[PDB]
Amino acid sequence: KFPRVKNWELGSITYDTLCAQSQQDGPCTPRRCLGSLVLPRKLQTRPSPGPPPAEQLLSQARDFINQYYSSIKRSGSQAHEERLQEVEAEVASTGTYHLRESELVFGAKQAWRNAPRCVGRIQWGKLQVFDARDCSSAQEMFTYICNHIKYATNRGNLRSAITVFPQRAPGRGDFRIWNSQLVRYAGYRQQDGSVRGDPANVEITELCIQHGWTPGNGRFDVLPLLLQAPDEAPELFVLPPELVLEVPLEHPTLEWFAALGLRWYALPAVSNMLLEIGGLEFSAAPFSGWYMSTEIGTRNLCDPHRYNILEDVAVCMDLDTRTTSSLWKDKAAVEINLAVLHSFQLAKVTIVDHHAATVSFMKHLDNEQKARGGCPADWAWIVPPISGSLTPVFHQEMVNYILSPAFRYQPDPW
Amino acid sequence: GPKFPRVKNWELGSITYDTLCAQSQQDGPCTPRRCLGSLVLPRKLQTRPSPGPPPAEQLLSQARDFINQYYSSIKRSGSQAHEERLQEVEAEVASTGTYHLRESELVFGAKQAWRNAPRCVGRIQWGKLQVFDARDCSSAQEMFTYICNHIKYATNRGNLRSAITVFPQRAPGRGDFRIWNSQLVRYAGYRQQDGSVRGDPANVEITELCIQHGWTPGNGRFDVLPLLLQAPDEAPELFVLPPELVLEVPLEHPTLEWFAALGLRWYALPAVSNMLLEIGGLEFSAAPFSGWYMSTEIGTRNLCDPHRYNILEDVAVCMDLDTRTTSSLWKDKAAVEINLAVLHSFQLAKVTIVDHHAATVSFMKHLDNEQKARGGCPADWAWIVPPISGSLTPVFHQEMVNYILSPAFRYQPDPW
Ligand code: HEM
Ligand code: HEM
Ligand SMILES: O=[N+]([O-])c1cccc2c(Br)n[nH]c12
Ligand SMILES: O=[N+]([O-])c1cccc2c(Br)n[nH]c12
Ligand SMILES: O=[N+]([O-])c1cccc2c(Br)n[nH]c12
Ligand SMILES: O=[N+]([O-])c1cccc2c(Br)n[nH]c12
Ligand SMILES: [Zn+2]
């Protein structure tokens, strides 16, 4: 049952014993591996057409409360026993329960630590957790979100944070942020199918306009937020521009790069995932860290279905875009990534390159092997999208599995 | 909807369902509880040499399935000829414990093993494999001749041709034919007294075995190894490939004049020789196969892996890059130029080579061909996406289903 895990660069072997604590199934079976699939249809987080089975809920809740008491080393303490009894009395009478703020803080940090696709987990213990479960309206949601962005941005010296809105409840609508990130650029279907802006955001852009936003016409128009309180239409909120830190892109030696008029925002803030702690589900719990430079330079600017800028930059570079074998894509991608690093560095905004980040992730794997006997990791997401085998994680076998607390995908609210 | 894995392409937003995986009758290393997809050698395909034949029923089940695939492929399933072949195979197993393939069956089988290889990006070529039948081989000397003829056919003065040479199958009460080398052409790895390795560090063990068996070692960075060839129940015998049969390409760069001075080179012919070819339960323990290179394999993996030639820093220093900080992207810049020199050099030498952009575009066509032909394609995303510029290629954006279909190429334990 326990996997032998090899590092092919160093020749070292470890055994993952943490995976036996996984209680939830992924999509692979012995007859076929589906590890490269991006989204589930089983791992998701089905609405509440009535509360979960109480035996299922209290099973997850007791395991979480046990995780917490172990975490502060007061396992078996009277507090531990008294807490377990409170949670059980609550689920027996009401079909649900509530977490103490200290439990919430531990849970959100553990969800990050457990996220198999995140290469930045060496930071997992340094997470600012904002409790927003005292929130009864979309306008209040907006205030908490602005305060999050202000904290996390910190004038360019970014700090990881999460804001947790009230949990799901059976027979009642969810709190939701419709946006997939707190800061994203509009995507406008221009006449002829083609898109101005970020093609990934055409649908959310359209929803914003249909909910009364007056659209811009630029390539980098920051989107308004669509926030929804239970069983209400989402409400539109424009972020105050002074809250949204952006970095114009320039290259340290190619004069013309700046003329491309590229920019990116500083704060990566994922806002449409579900945070699951002890069987409780937080449908609105936006979290933010800082960027790995390849995410901007390679995926967001160079993906064919995104800004797709490779050929423009290659032409500016005078490269031979006529045959694959000139490696024009590869050369242009490196300079684009270099421009991102130089530019963030120049602006004094937190950024980490993919070599530094994967070196730290290897340190994190070693830390975790000692602390818990393993670390769930999804190779396809941990290895960067350029220069894969040039980083140490490529040569490291990994084991993927789901531990709780967890961040999960959930259906779009529309 | 369909009770099969749903597969998405995120660049194009298209969906397919893989029904082919329902034919898999050999399990992988994953469970609903945890994915082991990134492990390089799962103990599954792998084969711990069974002292004697297969269980008659196990072997018969695999043989029947294979013969059924064969008659389906020529469109005669359920036919008189098909029934008779199943009877003959059953009778031969009952009387001898094993059976033998017709020539056309071996050819079908060998092509199907390549088509079925989930880690191979070059599978659009699968129908154009040249199958050399060497099942009459009876000595190590004869194995060497067969291998020299393969190498000459396959290399073809630089216009490479895919080929496989199949030596006699494993048999009850008899040792195996084995090629000890992992490729027909490999460079030596020599352990230094100070602990470094000169040459290819991946090949220290095979290099020391060649020496232990009588080879007189060189001490260069790119010394072609001799072959250690083993006929049933004999010690391996050593053969030196005549140099004129081993085509090599000295590496230069199109604009960086100093690159040629580094004295780097690579061989033209990638020819895997230590895998097991399995067809209908029969095991061809010696069945070397060869194609042509994808340039990243040479330029990125063989020259720049930290546990291989590890040349990145040296080239980066020559390019005057800042190797003392990660954010200069010195590794990335050097890697791009090493891969460009590999493509340029092979192109200049008129030696077949394919860049990773062209290879992955053709693999996307292969996937579309196979969706129609078989309802899916087993594919191992971590091996199909190239080791540089991964998301710059179409395959990155394609979700993949990985599973084991037979006929198959499998790992097998080293002969020593
Ligand atoms: C501190 C710096 C951080 C860096 C540099 C970083 C980097 C990454 C990268 C490169 C990805 C793979 C790409 C993706 O899935 O979108 C990722 C994914 C992820 N990260 Fe991190 N991360 C950081 C902070 C955070 C924080 C603070 C959390 C949570 C509290 C977090 C949770 C996750 C999750 C859940 C994913 C999976 C996203 C998905 O499935 O779409 N990360 N991270
Ligand atoms: C025509 C050109 C070909 C190209 C460009 C090519 C390219 C590749 C690449 C890049 C790999 C991944 C690296 C690896 O797994 O070692 C690979 C793997 C493989 N190829 Fe191909 N291939 C070609 C022909 C062949 C042929 C002729 C066969 C067999 C008849 C073959 C069978 C396989 C197998 C079995 C693997 C997996 C090796 C392993 O797991 O160690 N390929 N190929
Ligand atoms: O840097 N990233 O590439 C990246 C990707 C996805 C999520 C996050 C967060 Br939250 N911080 N950085 C992230
Ligand atoms: O070494 N690894 O751990 C590992 C995992 C997945 C793919 C590859 C390839 Br291709 N070489 N090494 C790999
Ligand atoms: O090009 N390649 O990278 C490559 C890798 C592994 C096996 C083969 C064969 Br056989 N032809 N090319 C191959
Ligand atoms: O698109 N994909 O099929 C796919 C598979 C595996 C990982 C990734 C990432 Br990271 N982006 N897209 C991916
Ligand atoms: Zn898997």
From Swiss-Prot, chain B:
Produces nitric oxide (NO) which is implicated in vascular smooth muscle relaxation through a cGMP-mediated signal transduction pathway. NO mediates vascular endothelial growth factor (VEGF)-induced angiogenesis in coronary vessels and promotes blood clotting through the activation of platelets. The lineage of its organism: Eukaryota, Metazoa, Chordata, Craniata, Vertebrata. L-arginine binds at Q183, W292, Y293, E297, N302. (6R)-L-erythro-5,6,7,8-tetrahydrobiopterin binds at S38, A382, W383, F396. It is found in: Cell membrane; Membrane, Caveola; Cytoplasm, Cytoskeleton; Golgi apparatus. Belongs to the NOS family. This is Nitric oxide synthase 3. It comes from Bos taurus. The modification Phosphoserine is found at S50. Heme b binds at C120, Y411. Zn(2+) binds at C30, C35. Phosphorylation of Ser-50 by CDK5 reduces activity. The chain holds residues 67 to 482 of 1205 of the full protein. Homodimer. Interacts with NOSIP and NOSTRIN. Interacts with HSP90AB1. Forms a complex with ASL, ASS1 and SLC7A1; the complex regulates cell-autonomous L-arginine synthesis and citrulline recycling while channeling extracellular L-arginine to nitric oxide synthesis pathway. Residues 34-416 are annotated as: Interaction with NOSIP.
